[PDB]
Design a protein around this motif. Structure first.
Motif, PDB file in Angstrom:
ATOM      1  N   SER A  34      -4.632 -16.164   6.800  1.00  0.00           N
ATOM      2  CA  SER A  34      -4.021 -15.638   5.562  1.00  0.00           C
ATOM      3  C   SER A  34      -4.785 -16.017   4.281  1.00  0.00           C
ATOM      4  CB  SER A  34      -2.576 -16.129   5.422  1.00  0.00           C
ATOM      5  OG  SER A  34      -2.532 -17.536   5.350  1.00  0.00           O
ATOM      6  N   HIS A  35      -5.912 -16.713   4.404  1.00  0.00           N
ATOM      7  CA  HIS A  35      -6.712 -17.056   3.233  1.00  0.00           C
ATOM      8  C   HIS A  35      -7.504 -15.844   2.737  1.00  0.00           C
ATOM      9  CE1 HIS A  35      -6.152 -21.042   5.283  1.00  0.00           C
ATOM     10  NE2 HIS A  35      -5.753 -21.308   4.054  1.00  0.00           N
ATOM     11  N   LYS A  36      -7.869 -15.848   1.455  1.00  0.00           N
ATOM     12  CA  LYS A  36      -8.627 -14.739   0.860  1.00  0.00           C
ATOM     13  C   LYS A  36      -9.842 -14.354   1.708  1.00  0.00           C
ATOM     14  CE  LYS A  36     -10.523 -15.237  -3.278  1.00  0.00           C
ATOM     15  NZ  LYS A  36     -10.563 -15.279  -4.780  1.00  0.00           N
ATOM     16  N   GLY A  37     -10.594 -15.355   2.152  1.00  0.00           N
ATOM     17  CA  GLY A  37     -11.735 -15.143   3.025  1.00  0.00           C
ATOM     18  C   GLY A  37     -13.077 -14.984   2.317  1.00  0.00           C
ATOM     19  N   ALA A  38     -14.132 -14.991   3.128  1.00  0.00           N
ATOM     20  CA  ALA A  38     -15.500 -15.212   2.660  1.00  0.00           C
ATOM     21  C   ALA A  38     -16.165 -13.995   2.022  1.00  0.00           C
ATOM     22  CB  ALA A  38     -16.360 -15.737   3.811  1.00  0.00           C
ATOM     23  N   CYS A  39     -15.461 -12.855   1.974  1.00  0.00           N
ATOM     24  CA  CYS A  39     -15.938 -11.664   1.250  1.00  0.00           C
ATOM     25  C   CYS A  39     -15.189 -11.427  -0.068  1.00  0.00           C
ATOM     26  CB  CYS A  39     -15.873 -10.422   2.154  1.00  0.00           C
ATOM     27  SG  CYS A  39     -16.872 -10.613   3.666  1.00  0.00           S
ATOM     28  N   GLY A  40     -14.304 -12.344  -0.452  1.00  0.00           N
ATOM     29  CA  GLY A  40     -13.598 -12.226  -1.718  1.00  0.00           C
ATOM     30  C   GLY A  40     -12.572 -11.105  -1.777  1.00  0.00           C
ATOM     31  N   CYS A  41     -11.969 -10.764  -0.634  1.00  0.00           N
ATOM     32  CA  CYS A  41     -10.995  -9.660  -0.569  1.00  0.00           C
ATOM     33  C   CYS A  41      -9.575 -10.110  -0.923  1.00  0.00           C
ATOM     34  CB  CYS A  41     -11.057  -8.936   0.781  1.00  0.00           C
ATOM     35  SG  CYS A  41     -12.644  -8.085   1.075  1.00  0.00           S
ATOM     36  N   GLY A  42      -9.454 -10.548  -2.172  1.00  0.00           N
ATOM     37  CA  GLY A  42      -8.175 -10.849  -2.782  1.00  0.00           C
ATOM     38  C   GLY A  42      -8.371 -11.068  -4.265  1.00  0.00           C
ATOM     39  N   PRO A  43      -7.286 -11.285  -5.010  1.00  0.00           N
ATOM     40  CA  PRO A  43      -7.409 -11.519  -6.451  1.00  0.00           C
ATOM     41  C   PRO A  43      -8.377 -12.663  -6.763  1.00  0.00           C
ATOM     42  CG  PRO A  43      -5.137 -11.116  -5.888  1.00  0.00           C
ATOM     43  CD  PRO A  43      -5.878 -11.305  -4.590  1.00  0.00           C
TER      44      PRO A  43
ATOM     45  N   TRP B 226     -20.389 -17.137   1.806  1.00  0.00           N
ATOM     46  CA  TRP B 226     -19.747 -16.357   0.744  1.00  0.00           C
ATOM     47  C   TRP B 226     -20.625 -15.137   0.484  1.00  0.00           C
ATOM     48  CZ3 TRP B 226     -15.572 -15.379  -2.018  1.00  0.00           C
ATOM     49  CH2 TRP B 226     -15.647 -14.897  -3.334  1.00  0.00           C
ATOM     50  N   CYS B 227     -20.024 -13.951   0.439  1.00  0.00           N
ATOM     51  CA  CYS B 227     -20.760 -12.715   0.143  1.00  0.00           C
ATOM     52  C   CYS B 227     -21.976 -12.545   1.056  1.00  0.00           C
ATOM     53  CB  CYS B 227     -21.148 -12.630  -1.345  1.00  0.00           C
ATOM     54  SG  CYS B 227     -19.731 -12.694  -2.502  1.00  0.00           S
ATOM     55  N   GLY B 228     -21.727 -12.656   2.353  1.00  0.00           N
ATOM     56  CA  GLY B 228     -22.758 -12.430   3.344  1.00  0.00           C
ATOM     57  C   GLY B 228     -23.249 -10.990   3.373  1.00  0.00           C
ATOM     58  N   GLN B 229     -24.443 -10.820   3.928  1.00  0.00           N
ATOM     59  CA  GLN B 229     -25.079  -9.509   4.151  1.00  0.00           C
ATOM     60  C   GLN B 229     -24.122  -8.440   4.655  1.00  0.00           C
ATOM     61  OE1 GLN B 229     -27.963 -11.077   7.011  1.00  0.00           O
ATOM     62  NE2 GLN B 229     -29.678 -10.438   5.695  1.00  0.00           N
ATOM     63  N   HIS B 230     -23.299  -8.798   5.638  1.00  0.00           N
ATOM     64  CA  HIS B 230     -22.490  -7.815   6.342  1.00  0.00           C
ATOM     65  C   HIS B 230     -21.027  -7.773   5.909  1.00  0.00           C
ATOM     66  CE1 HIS B 230     -26.025  -7.537   9.291  1.00  0.00           C
ATOM     67  NE2 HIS B 230     -25.989  -6.449   8.545  1.00  0.00           N
ATOM     68  N   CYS B 231     -20.696  -8.425   4.793  1.00  0.00           N
ATOM     69  CA  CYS B 231     -19.389  -8.201   4.167  1.00  0.00           C
ATOM     70  C   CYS B 231     -19.178  -6.709   3.891  1.00  0.00           C
ATOM     71  CB  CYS B 231     -19.282  -8.956   2.839  1.00  0.00           C
ATOM     72  SG  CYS B 231     -18.817 -10.700   2.982  1.00  0.00           S
ATOM     73  N   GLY B 232     -18.003  -6.207   4.242  1.00  0.00           N
ATOM     74  CA  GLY B 232     -17.639  -4.815   3.992  1.00  0.00           C
ATOM     75  C   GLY B 232     -18.155  -3.801   5.002  1.00  0.00           C
ATOM     76  N   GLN B 233     -18.958  -4.245   5.972  1.00  0.00           N
ATOM     77  CA  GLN B 233     -19.506  -3.334   6.970  1.00  0.00           C
ATOM     78  C   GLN B 233     -18.431  -3.053   8.012  1.00  0.00           C
ATOM     79  OE1 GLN B 233     -22.511  -4.577   9.970  1.00  0.00           O
ATOM     80  NE2 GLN B 233     -23.859  -3.101   8.915  1.00  0.00           N
ATOM     81  N   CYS B 234     -18.360  -1.799   8.463  1.00  0.00           N
ATOM     82  CA  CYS B 234     -17.440  -1.417   9.531  1.00  0.00           C
ATOM     83  C   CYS B 234     -18.151  -1.329  10.880  1.00  0.00           C
ATOM     84  CB  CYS B 234     -16.729  -0.102   9.201  1.00  0.00           C
ATOM     85  SG  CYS B 234     -15.487  -0.298   7.890  1.00  0.00           S
TER      86      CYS B 234
ATOM     87  N   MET C 217     -11.464   0.586  -0.806  1.00  0.00           N
ATOM     88  CA  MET C 217     -10.741  -0.669  -0.647  1.00  0.00           C
ATOM     89  C   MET C 217     -11.677  -1.869  -0.699  1.00  0.00           C
ATOM     90  SD  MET C 217      -8.020   0.850   2.069  1.00  0.00           S
ATOM     91  CE  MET C 217      -7.339  -0.452   2.462  1.00  0.00           C
ATOM     92  N   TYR C 218     -12.816  -1.793  -0.015  1.00  0.00           N
ATOM     93  CA  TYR C 218     -13.781  -2.893  -0.082  1.00  0.00           C
ATOM     94  C   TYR C 218     -14.277  -3.114  -1.531  1.00  0.00           C
ATOM     95  CZ  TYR C 218     -17.585  -6.094   0.449  1.00  0.00           C
ATOM     96  OH  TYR C 218     -18.370  -7.210   0.287  1.00  0.00           O
ATOM     97  N   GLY C 219     -14.327  -2.048  -2.332  1.00  0.00           N
ATOM     98  CA  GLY C 219     -14.692  -2.155  -3.736  1.00  0.00           C
ATOM     99  C   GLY C 219     -13.823  -3.079  -4.577  1.00  0.00           C
ATOM    100  N   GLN C 220     -12.608  -3.343  -4.110  1.00  0.00           N
ATOM    101  CA  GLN C 220     -11.716  -4.332  -4.715  1.00  0.00           C
ATOM    102  C   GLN C 220     -12.180  -5.775  -4.527  1.00  0.00           C
ATOM    103  OE1 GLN C 220      -7.688  -3.757  -3.348  1.00  0.00           O
ATOM    104  NE2 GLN C 220      -7.875  -1.514  -3.424  1.00  0.00           N
ATOM    105  N   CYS C 221     -12.975  -6.030  -3.485  1.00  0.00           N
ATOM    106  CA  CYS C 221     -13.381  -7.381  -3.109  1.00  0.00           C
ATOM    107  C   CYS C 221     -14.468  -7.884  -4.050  1.00  0.00           C
ATOM    108  CB  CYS C 221     -13.902  -7.384  -1.663  1.00  0.00           C
ATOM    109  SG  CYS C 221     -12.684  -6.723  -0.463  1.00  0.00           S
ATOM    110  N   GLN C 222     -14.459  -9.182  -4.342  1.00  0.00           N
ATOM    111  CA  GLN C 222     -15.418  -9.738  -5.291  1.00  0.00           C
ATOM    112  C   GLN C 222     -16.861  -9.555  -4.826  1.00  0.00           C
ATOM    113  OE1 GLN C 222     -14.486 -13.699  -6.570  1.00  0.00           O
ATOM    114  NE2 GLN C 222     -16.367 -13.928  -7.791  1.00  0.00           N
ATOM    115  N   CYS C 223     -17.093  -9.601  -3.517  1.00  0.00           N
ATOM    116  CA  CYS C 223     -18.453  -9.491  -3.000  1.00  0.00           C
ATOM    117  C   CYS C 223     -19.049  -8.080  -3.068  1.00  0.00           C
ATOM    118  CB  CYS C 223     -18.527 -10.055  -1.580  1.00  0.00           C
ATOM    119  SG  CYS C 223     -18.171 -11.838  -1.516  1.00  0.00           S
ATOM    120  N   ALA C 224     -18.224  -7.079  -3.352  1.00  0.00           N
ATOM    121  CA  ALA C 224     -18.730  -5.719  -3.593  1.00  0.00           C
ATOM    122  C   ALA C 224     -19.501  -5.602  -4.921  1.00  0.00           C
ATOM    123  CB  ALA C 224     -17.582  -4.721  -3.563  1.00  0.00           C
ATOM    124  N   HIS C 225     -19.376  -6.615  -5.776  1.00  0.00           N
ATOM    125  CA  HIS C 225     -19.926  -6.619  -7.135  1.00  0.00           C
ATOM    126  C   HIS C 225     -20.705  -7.899  -7.437  1.00  0.00           C
ATOM    127  CE1 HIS C 225     -17.347  -3.136  -8.100  1.00  0.00           C
ATOM    128  NE2 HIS C 225     -16.550  -3.700  -7.209  1.00  0.00           N
TER     129      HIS C 225
END
Length: 180
Positions: free
Chosen positions: A25-34, A64-72, A172-180
């Motif tokens: 339940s933690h935000k996690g390593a791609c920053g997908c939370g506030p 944090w913000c690894g290469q493959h964050c947001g990849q499906c 949706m991934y665009g909401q995550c901090q690591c998208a930016h």
């Protein structure tokens, strides 16, 4: 039973991935939370999301913000499973998972997420990739998937979101901090 064979494990000319159903339940390593805090967005808990084994998450060992964050990643069941660490499933079932977190190469993941390289390595069961699949709402076990053995491929998140809204979209991934 493991239907994949060789080092690393392969099935009919396709690379295999092991899986473990987990809940985090933690935000996690791609920053997908506030941004301020350690909470997830509202969508993470019920989506098809995953934590990727360290060297796949990021070959440079980032946490944090690894290469493959947001990849499906589209997973297809082989019909197999690791003895005593999963169970039977129909072959050829498939769903797509967005990588939103890291499965670190440390206890308690030392048997599963310990590949030495991004490709061509192996965990203790022989697989070059491992995904921990979020299952706190039974999205995975509800399909009869008890840590299935799979083959894996990279796919466009939007295409798969259309078939099953539980797979997050690129928006949706665009909401995550690591998208930016």
């Amino acid at each position: 039973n493991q239907k994949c064979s060789g080092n690393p494990r392969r099935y009919n000319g396709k690379s295999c991935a092991s899986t473990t159903n987990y809940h985090d339940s933690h935000k996690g390593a791609c920053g997908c939370g506030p941004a301020s805090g350690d909470a997830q967005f509202g969508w993470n808990a019920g989506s098809f999301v995953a934590a990727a084994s360290q060297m796949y998450f990021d070959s440079g060992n980032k946490g944090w913000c690894g290469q493959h964050c947001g990849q499906c990643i589209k997973l297809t069941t082989t019909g197999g499973y690791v003895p005593g660490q999963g169970g039977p499933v129909r072959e050829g079932l498939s769903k797509t998972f967005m990588i939103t977190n890291l499965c670190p190469n440390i206890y308690p993941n030392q048997d599963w997420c310990n590949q030495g390289s991004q490709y061509g390595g192996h965990n203790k069961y022989g697989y070059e990739l491992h995904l921990d699949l979020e299952n706190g709402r039974s999205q995975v076990t509800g399909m009869g998937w008890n840590n299935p053995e799979t083959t894996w491929e990279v796919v466009n998140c939007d295409s798969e979101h259309n078939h099953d809204h539980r797979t997050p979209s690129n928006s949706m991934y665009g909401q995550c901090q690591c998208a930016h």
